[model samples]
Target chain A: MNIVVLISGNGSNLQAIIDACKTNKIKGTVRAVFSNKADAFGLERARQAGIATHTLIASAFDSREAYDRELIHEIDMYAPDVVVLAGFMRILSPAFVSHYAGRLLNIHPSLLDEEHGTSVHFVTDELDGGPVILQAKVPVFAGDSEDDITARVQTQEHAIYPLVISWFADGRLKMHENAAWLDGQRLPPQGYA
Target chain B: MNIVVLISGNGSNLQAIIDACKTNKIKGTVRAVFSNKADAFGLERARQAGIATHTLIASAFDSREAYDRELIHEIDMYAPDVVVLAGFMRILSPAFVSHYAGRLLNIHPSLLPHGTSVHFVTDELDGGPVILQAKVPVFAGDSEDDITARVQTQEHAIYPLVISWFADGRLKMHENAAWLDGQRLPPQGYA
Candidate 1:
């Protein structure tokens, strides 16, 4: 399966994906990687992995719609089976979200619950918007600084992104009516535990 | 006039244009700046000047044609009066060059003469040749680095001058040749 990963920063998650792809853990090759910032170190990571890389700056376009149009055009060039957002910062347009729809996956730093409003709810265009695949659990310790919490969450993020990708590769992950379905069974209200 | 500048590296030429715009030396506003590398410090320069900035990686596209298509799309969205290739590295496809045609201007480190073969000749696609070229001399006793320095200094001079002329409507460039006061420039034997 062809995969495209988008990023905007350090790309630790992107690195994880690249490593997983190399080890056959994800069961697919990463066809390409993109970053909105030309200087994003993530690009080097992609290059080192022998994956194709691209950088498109959002501020160059006149409007958000224009930016999205060009971005979507580039993404479509890859004809990816799935597009992964790993620390990509821009809020995708509805056109983008809907176009990719069930094939889009995003990783969040915090755990999410249907009943408890969380930061992940604000990650996408819609409130409580569900990813076709969502998985996470990172405990916050009392003495954890912001960095400490981020580091721990990132560790979980690295693990979860690959598992979901593996599932997609195995054909065990699907999107149905705003919820995730795994192995032909509907996940819990929040997501598969 | 709204201008868009494309660069790939140091952007000294871009810096010159930005300075010219800020000081009213050039009678146009740089509407936006683009770099193929996201971490190009040039983006910071553009940002400090209050110009919009973007980074588009050419390798992301399947082909040169596809990359140019999206690049042109972004450039067109600004409705720029002129598209400047300050230090942009990618070799544009013929379609891209022809699409912009007369409005595309490029800067070169070496001096160009109509008769002389030079590096700038390879910079763009066929039939959609460069509109304007600002050339620099390679002096004796100048090593490669010295030549590079000399060329960059020349780049600054040439970029601002052409932009200034462009802003004043004193120059017109077409795919085949350039015109100043309706006079065609003759090519030198060695550029």
Candidate 2:
């Protein structure tokens, strides 16, 4: 499968995806890496791997709608089978979410349906909201500040994001409407972590 | 002077700025318009006004830092004297803000320093935040559309004023404050 990854920061998650693809752990090739910020360290990772790279600055545009238009144009240029949101920070429009729909996958850092913590969800019309795909549950012991919890969650993200992408690449995961089906069976409530 | 305007939606604020520039109410010509979303009607408005236009998708990037780098690159191409955010959505990174620094300007829809409302200014001058926020009162029978229209009126009024200030050189960013007519304005409330 061909994949395009979107990111906006350090890209530790992106590194995980790249490593998985390289080691044959995931049955796909990362076609390109697109960043809103050109300085993202993730771009360097992609370059080192010889993957194609592109950057577009959102601030150069007049509005979110205008920016998304160019973004859609850019993503379409790659003809990706799956678009991965690997640390990409911008909120996507409903039009954008629907355009990719089930083919779009994201990795979050916390348990799904949990309260008061950071987690990843699918891209939907609602902000910070989407159906639960794969969720990682990290134990939050006492004395855990926001950063502490984030570090633990990042570990799980690195594992699960690639696993989920592999599911897409190997044809084990199917998107039907708004839900993900695994081997023709509906995924369980918490999703695979 | 060359100016760059950023917008996200209907382009009403952009319309006001375009009219203000055309009528000589504001100084400087609009060199280009940048939008985060391609379908924003504002692009059409820019074309109608005969201004150049560009679009960049934020989600296309791997990270905000990556996005901002590209954004800065595009803005530099125009060599703008002022960067105005008309209705653009997206929280700018400090790196992006400091790059333009004093030259960036924005607009909010409500009274300044008001509770849970919107205000506009340089990203650094107001701290790091996005400009296009508004909180209109919801009457008992009001729908989402009703609230949007009410708040939009305020945005149109406020955005043009801020753009005009930038064009006239009356609005300046100074050491954590937006200075108007040499007087440091109050800090925006949760802008």
Candidate 3:
């Protein structure tokens, strides 16, 4: 399936997924790039790779869902089979969230099901908060500031997000109860030892 | 406490521990060396490093425990604080295990509490029968006639055993139910 990736600011996680896709480790092509911020560096990255890029002004629409409508419209232009929210920062409205539902995947920095939206910055910055469903925990190092934590978090986010995306692309991923569920296998249990 | 390392093959693990101890990564000194096979390469490695070396014949004794007794006697000659089983193949008797219960430590080839045995040959080897456990699981690749398998297992057994003796000294690790519990602070759990 082709994927449409959305991002804001630095595109390290975008680079990670692109690397994975280029290597054939991930089974999808980058169909388009969409970002809310016009200044997002990822747009240049996507343009360099010959993918189409779109930027929307969030304030142009009266409501958050209306802004998301522009996003949906631009996303549909590529006929993408899946939408990957690499680092799009705005809160997703329930109406917009339900619209894409299982057809969308996101990466989150925190271990999932933690206090959502409390926003522990730096720690999970790299994981790119793709979607609430696909969040994976990237640890906050001792004595890390927001920038320090984000730098480290983004590195790991880049490393892990592609594998998670490939799982979806390969029919090996599912979403149930706000968690990424492997199609036929449960994860190794907590306290694995 | 002083340690008397015993080895019957290439003492790469012993060498690593030696290096760590030299760097103060481990807190103990190698008081002596003991081996079952006199011509074993590891004995030479110890001797070359200027550590004392001893060899006792198991066939010269009647039973495994008799071998253990003599082995224990030779070990005691140096007054070692702990006995580390690094690449020593002979299984000890129940009495020996009880005697050293907490004092002795071993490095098994397969991940412990899982694959257990002496024949950890690589052709017959599996990936990670041992995790980051007290035991080690070998990575998989095979060469002719299980030679590489046996050699890799021996190498795996010695490195951690050496460092452990040192960790015992530096960390002052003791024989607790959870091995890392011996450290003054707990070892980090699995990632």
Candidate 4:
């Protein structure tokens, strides 16, 4: 019924979801944005949208459990039925994950199944992966820098993250206990799918 | 001596630092990029640069501190002198912050000391904050999203964050640590 996006930095992914929900590309309302970083740029991103923004700095909590508890508490306060891990960097404890279980979703950057860890360039620069769910490949062109790649990817990320949300909202997919349920059907071989 | 960039989703800020280093605009090499998200698009960005990339998924770890330790371990392996938190989204442990101390830098979306939090159209529909760090101000007219207003703020973030690193190396402006020795300079009050 409601969607929540978690972010720690720029909130670009959060913004894209907001757009998706707003444009009816996704059938949801962005209930809130919860960030673990007190200085999370996403706070401003959420504020700009006039959406409620909440911050529970990890620094304020003495332990990770404390932080996760506070984070889960804040997220639960919104009563969000769905949680989309847009860019929130803090790893959730199983306790937290179990709280939302079937309603949580995350948008990973690499073309899944091929590159799970970072350093994608090092792995895929020479090796090719087959049929990535969706990929916005940035070629090794001359004069490219870290910022150059990011500028382009952010362009693509805005497009991709939102569309994925739309897919979920449209009932084309559903999140279930760390797996995706498509059209009322839970994906088999979760990881491979 | 070394620079580590953190990219959460995209790596534009990473590319900027790479260019600045390549052009000698800044003094350092991209030692590695540690993305909390394993499939960060910037990991590919790092690969293209021929630099090493490391992934330490927070979820795979038991806690944020554990993940930070693993991440810091990977980062320390590179022996980087500076850490650039480009678009990296995870909140860091204070212990990790102390370990890197003064050597860490971040690229924020809005102008610092002002637009410190996330600014989205939904909140600041009339265009976020009043503090605008104008690289080119007094525009003739408004530009559309695709054509003119392409949100090159990533460009702004990379340069400012890199230049801060420059100031750190040249003037010893310690970033994220207690000010040890630089002349405290105040901002040029907005007009």
| Stretches of candidate 4 exceeding 4 Å from the true structure | A113-138, A176-179, A184-193, B1-191
Docking quality tier of model 1: incorrect
lDDT score, candidate 3, position A33:
69
Q: What is the interface RMSD of each candidate, in Å?
A: 7.2, 12.7, 34.7, 15.6
What would the per-residue lDDT of candidate 4 be over residues B1-191, giving only the tens digit for each residue?
Answer: 67777777768767777777777767667766666654466655665675654445544457777667656765775667777677788766668766765566554444544222211111222322221133323244545443223345535553544344443554233221222234432231121
Listed in order, each prediction's TM-score against the native is 0.70, 0.49, 0.41, 0.43
- List model 2 lDDT by residue over A163-193, tens digit each: 8888788888876766667778776656643
Give lDDT per model, in order.
Answer: 0.69, 0.70, 0.57, 0.57
Candidate 1 vs candidate 2: the lDDT winner is 2
Model 1 per-residue lDDT tens digits across residues A5-98: 8888788989988888889988888877877875676766665565655556766677888778877876787789988888888767788888
DockQ winner: 1
Writing each residue's lDDT as its tens digit, candidate 4 over A109-175 gives 5544122221111011112221122345445456667687667666777776676566656667654
Better of 1 and 3 by DockQ: 1
Report how far off residue B176 is in candidate 3 (Å): 96
TM-score of candidate 3 relative to the true fold: 0.41
Q: In model 3, which runs have C-alpha deviations exceeding 4 angstroms?
A: A113-148, A177-179, A186-193, B1-191
Residue A47 in model 1: shift from native, Å?
A: 7.6
